[PDB]
Amino acid sequence: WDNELSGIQNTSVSLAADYVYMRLATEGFVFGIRSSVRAPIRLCDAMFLMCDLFERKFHDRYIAPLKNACLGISAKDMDMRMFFSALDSVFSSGISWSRIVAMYAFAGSVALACARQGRRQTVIAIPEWIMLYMRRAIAPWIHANGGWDSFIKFSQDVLNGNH
Ligand SMILES: [Cl-]
Ligand SMILES: [Cl-]
Ligand SMILES: [Cl-]
């Protein structure tokens, strides 16, 4: 059954795969998992560029809280439970497009840390971590706040206003 929530979920995990492998490539880890861009191109562009902007210009507001939640966990021990707990530590106070960008950016950070430790099977699972995490609260929030199209408009506004 194709319904709007399952559609949002399919888009979220396609996007998570694109973003994780793109982020890895920016540091020279070229996994070659994908044959093509999996999410819609405009959305893939939007998430990659928003994550980059947040890493460069909004790191301590959006990304540091997730990293700090994981302080003292080695890359060898990073797992989906850690990932969920860190995300919970922010989303417990609310959901926003900026916090969703932070979740994807942080998944990239975790992927990079695992790739540097050679934990290949963990890296390739991180897109599923995002998909599974979003089922309980993020996915219905996205549905109620305009779908991924609303993220595109948000991203266009933010990216057009930063230079
Ligand atoms: Cl529907
Ligand atoms: Cl790839
Ligand atoms: Cl809200």
Residue numbers in the entry: 6 to 168
From the paper:
The pro-survival BCL-2 proteins possess four BH domains (BH1–BH4) and inhibit apoptosis by binding directly to the two sub-classes of pro-apoptotic proteins, BAX/BAK/BOK and BH3-only proteins. BCL-2 proteins are defined by the presence of four regions of sequence homology, the BCL-2 homology domains (BH1–BH4). Based on the C. elegans prototype, nematode BCL-2 proteins inhibit apoptosis by sequestering the apoptosome scaffold protein, CED-4, on mitochondria. We show that the BCL-2-regulated pathway in multiple nematodes is distinct from the classically recognised pathway in C. elegans, with clear evidence for expansion of the multi-BH domain BCL-2-type proteins in some species and notable structural differences in both the BCL-2 and the APAF-1/CED-4 homologues.
Thus, due to the functional importance of this region in C. elegans, we attempted to determine the crystal structure of both BCL-2 proteins of T. suis (designated as T. suis A and T. suis B for convenience), a representative species of clade I. We were only able to obtain crystals for T. suis A and determined its structure to high resolution (1.6 Å), revealing a classic BCL-2-fold consisting of eight α-helices. Helices α3–α4, which line the BH3 binding-groove, are essentially parallel, similar to the apo-BCL-XL structure, though closer together, particularly towards the top of the groove, resulting in a “closed” conformation, as seen in several other BCL-2 structures. The end of α3 is noticeably disordered relative to other apo-BCL-2 structures. The unstructured loop connecting α1–α2, which is significantly shorter in T. suis BCL-2 (and CED-9) compared with BCL-XL and BCL-2, was well-defined and packs primarily against α1, although with some contacts with the beginning of α6. Helix α1 is well-resolved throughout its entire length and its very N-terminal portion is in close proximity to α7, a feature not evident for other BCL-2 protein structures. Helix α8 is also extended relative to that of BCL-XL and is visible through essentially all of the juxta-transmembrane region, which is usually not seen in most BCL-2 structures. Notably, however, the short loop at the α4–α5 junction observed in the CED-9 structure was absent. As this loop is thought to be critical for CED-4 dissociation, this structure indicates that the regulation of apoptosis in T. suis is potentially distinct from C. elegans. Curiously, the loop following helix α4 in CED-9 which is required for release from CED-4 is absent from BCL-2 proteins representing clade I nematodes, as is the case in mammalian BCL-2 proteins which do not directly engage APAF-1. While this observation does not discount the possibility that BCL-2 proteins of clade I nematodes inhibit apoptosome formation in the same manner as occurs in C. elegans, it does suggest that the molecular details of the “release” mechanism are distinct from the free-living nematode.
